[PDB]
Amino acid sequence: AYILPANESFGPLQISLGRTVKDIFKFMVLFIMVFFAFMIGMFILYSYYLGAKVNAAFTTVEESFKTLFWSIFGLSEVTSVVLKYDHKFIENIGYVLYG
Amino acid sequence: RFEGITTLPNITVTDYPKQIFRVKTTQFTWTEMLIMVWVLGMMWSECKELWLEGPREYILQLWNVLDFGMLSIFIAAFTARFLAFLQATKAQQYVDSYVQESDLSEVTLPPEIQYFTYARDKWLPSDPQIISEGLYAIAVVLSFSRI
Ligand SMILES: CC(C)CCC[C@@H](C)[C@H]1CC[C@H]2[C@@H]3CC=C4C[C@@H](OC(=O)CCC(=O)O)CC[C@]4(C)[C@H]3CC[C@]12C
Ligand SMILES: CC(C)CCC[C@@H](C)[C@H]1CC[C@H]2[C@@H]3CC=C4C[C@@H](OC(=O)CCC(=O)O)CC[C@]4(C)[C@H]3CC[C@]12C
Numbered sequence: 496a497y498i499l500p501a502n503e504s505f506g507p508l509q510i511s512l513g514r515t516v517k518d519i520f521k522f523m524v525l526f527i528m529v530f531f532a533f534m535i536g537m538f539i540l541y542s543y544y545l546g547a548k549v550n551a552a553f554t555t556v557e558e559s560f561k562t563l564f565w566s567i568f569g570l571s572e573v574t575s576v577v578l579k580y581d582h583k584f585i586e587n588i589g590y591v592l593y594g
Numbered sequence: 595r596f597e598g599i600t601t602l603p604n605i606t607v608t609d610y611p612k613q614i615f616r617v618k619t620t621q622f623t624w625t626e627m628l629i630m631v632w633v634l635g636m637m638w639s640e641c642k643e644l645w646l647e648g649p650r651e652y653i654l655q656l657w658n659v660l661d662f663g664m665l666s667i668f669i670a671a672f673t674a675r676f677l678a679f680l681q682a683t684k685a686q687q688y689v690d691s692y693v694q695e696s697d698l699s700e701v702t703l704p705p706e707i708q709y710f711t712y713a714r715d716k717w718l719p720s721d722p723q724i725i726s727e728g729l730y731a732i733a734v735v736l737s738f739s740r741i
């Protein structure tokens with residue numbers, strides 16, 4: 496992309512692409528604050544359930560980050576919320592927060 | 595718990611032999627004390643704002659309602675945890691005064707207070723501790739809205 500501006504057909508495209516990348520950086524910062532809100536909140540909810548979950552989704556901070564990030568592209572299942580125990584109150588809170 | 599809890603939710607770890615497990619789980623820490631003080635101060639400020647202006651003046655603001663909502667849940671979670679702590683304390687007091695059976699392993703406790711030696715799996719679905727952390731997670735999420 497460094498030598499791309501030299502072309503008349505692809506020059507304007509690479510310039511406009513760089514403009515949007517700068518533009519979305521400000522919007523990405525706002526989503527980071529939202530992303531960090533649910534990462535801490537859902538990790539706290541599911542930290543105590545390590546061996547009591549279908550998967551290890553929200554158990555640790557790293558895994559809470561991984562589960563929430565890949566939910567952006569629809570690559571995280573809804574079974575991230577389901578608990579093995581009958582603590583339906585905590586499970587339904589996870590359903591609402593994830594929703 | 596940043597890297598997770600070493601102990602499984604099925605095993606109870608008590609520091610000293612005659613401790614009720616629920617006492618250790620539900621006891622407040624120093625960080626818990628500061629958070630409660632912080633929430634109490636923020637709730638106090640919100641009440642003064644409401645008192646001087648009245649309901650209608652205060653109720654029609656997006657930040658004021660959300661601040662009242664997150665502080666109500668924060669107080670709700672702490673009240674539930676204190677109720678769970680009080681129940682554990684009642685079991686603990688009975689244990690150290692009516693049981694002399696060397697670490698609460700061989701002795702069979704009455705079912706009312708025997709429940710306070712169970713791990714997370716055997717907890718009731720509606721016991722205050724589970725309700726406490728269920729509501730506490732909601733308040734933590736709502737906190738970052740004030741950013
Ligand atoms: C097809 C596979 C095997 C290789 C593809 C690599 C391309 C992505 C690179 C290799 C050479 C590059 C080109 C080298 C020469 C030019 C001419 C350069 O200037 C011109 O368009 C001619 C008019 C002018 O220079 O004013 C603009 C960039 C461009 C198209 C480059 C565009 C990107 C190219 C095609
Ligand atoms: C402006 C401020 C003062 C609002 C604060 C309201 C709270 C002081 C009240 C309102 C709803 C109450 C809660 C309603 C539901 C429950 C479930 C309850 O669970 C049980 O005790 C049933 C199981 C059992 O222990 O047998 C624990 C207390 C709690 C959190 C209550 C604690 C006191 C709460 C939070």
Ligand SMILES: [Ca+2]
Binds near residue numbers: 640643657658661
């Ligand atoms: Ca206010």
